[PDB]
Symmetry: C5
Subunit: 99 residues, 5 copies
C-alpha cells in the first residue's frame, strides 16, 4: 500500500490517491490530438503521464515514464497521486512498490 | 487486445489499427538510403518507428523505441496505430500490453 | 556491509552512514511542495535523492536514480551516506551491493 | 535469420551481411587511438559500433549500442551489415533477433 | 579472460590490464572530495570510472557506467585497462564478458 509519506504528500493536494494499481498497457502516441504518454490499469482506468521540458521536472517526469514501464513489464503495483476530475486524469506523483 | 482508449484514438486518424503483434526483430540502420529504426513481426511485416528532434515528440518517439525493444526482448505483444502512406508503414502510436 | 572505501568516505563528512537498507518503494513527485525523487525502506524510513543540473553532478545524481530503482526492482540492498539536516534526509552517496 | 527486409537493405549497400552472430564481449575505450565502442563475437571477430554527434544518426547509433549490450547480456543473436575487409569492421546496421 | 584486441589496446598505454574481476558494489558519490562513480570488487579493490563532458568521450563513459552496473547486477566479469597513477585507479577501458 501507499507509504505514509506518499499518502501525506497527496492529501495536501487537491488530487486523489489511488493505491495498489496494476498497470497493463503503456502507450506512446504522437497523433496531434492525443500527443502524449498514457497508462491503463487492469480496471480500465486511463492516466496521462505529466510532461516537462525544463529542469527540474524534466527529471521527475522522465522517471515517471521509467516507473510506469517497469510496472507494466514486471507486474509490480503502483500508487498514484492524480487529478480527480478529468478523462484521462493526469499523474502528479507515482510510487513504485516492491511490497 | 487494444484498450478502448487506444482504439478510439487511432480511429480518429487516417491510420489503421494493428492488434496483437508479436515483434521478433529490432533494427537500427544508418545507411542514408534506408536510415531508420524498424521492427519486424513474427509474420514478417515491417514498420518504421517515428522520429522527431523537437520537444515534445522527441520524448514520445524515444518511448516508442523503448517499447519496441522491450517487446522484442520479452515476447510481450503490442497494438499499433500505423499509417499506410509509406513503405514500410510508420508507427504513430503504440501500446505495450502485459494484459 | 558497506565497503571500507564507502565507510571511510562517509565518515569524513557531516552526514551519517546507513547500511544494508532494503528499498521497497521508489517515488517521483512533481507536486509543488513535494517536488523530487524519494525512496522508502522496508522499515518505512524515507530519503530524498539529491539532484543536480550541471555537469558533473548531473551524471552522479542520474546514477543515484538508476541505483535506487535497481534496488527496488531486484531486492538488492544499498548502503547510504545521508545528511539528516533535511526532512526527509538527503542521499549524498549511495552504494549498490550484490554478491 | 536476417529478416528479408534487412537482407534487402544490406544487399543494396557495399557492406557484408553477417548472420546469426553471438556477441560475447562489449568494450568501451577512451584511450587516444583505440577510443570507441566494440563488440566481439564468440569466434573472435571484432566490430566497431558507429558513432555520431548529429541528429538523426545520434539516435540510431545510441540504439545500436543498446542492441549490442542487450545481445551480450541475454545471449540473443544479431544480424549485421558491416564492412568486410578491415579489422575492426564497422557496423552500419544491426538487427536484434528474438526469432 | 580479455580478448586479444582489448589486451593489445591496453598494452599500448601506461595503464595496466586487470582481468576476470567480479564487481560487487556500484557507488555514486557527490561529496566534495569523493565526487564520482566507483566500483568495488569481491576482492575489495576499488576503481574510479572515467568521466567526460564532451563528445565523443561522454558516449564511451556513459557506456562504462552501464557496463559496470550490469556487471554488479548480473555477476558477469569484466576486464579493465586501469591507470595506477591516481588513487583509486582510474578505468580507461572496460570489457564486459558473457561466455
Amino acid at each position: 500500500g501507499a507509504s505514509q509519506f506518499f499518502k501525506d504528500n497527496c492529501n495536501r493536494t487537491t488530487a486523489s490517491l489511488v493505491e495498489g494499481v496494476e498497470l497493463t498497457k503503456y502507450i506512446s502516441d504522437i497523433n496531434n490530438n492525443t500527443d502524449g504518454m498514457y497508462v491503463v490499469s487492469s480496471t480500465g482506468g486511463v492516466w496521462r503521464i505529466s510532461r516537462a521540458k525544463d529542469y527540474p521536472d524534466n527529471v521527475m517526469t522522465a522517471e515517471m515514464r521509467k516507473i510506469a514501464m517497469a510496472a507494466v513489464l514486471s507486474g509490480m503495483r503502483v500508487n498514484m497521486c492524480a487529478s480527480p476530475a478529468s478523462s484521462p486524469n493526469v499523474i502528479w506523483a507515482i510510487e513504485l512498490e516492491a511490497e
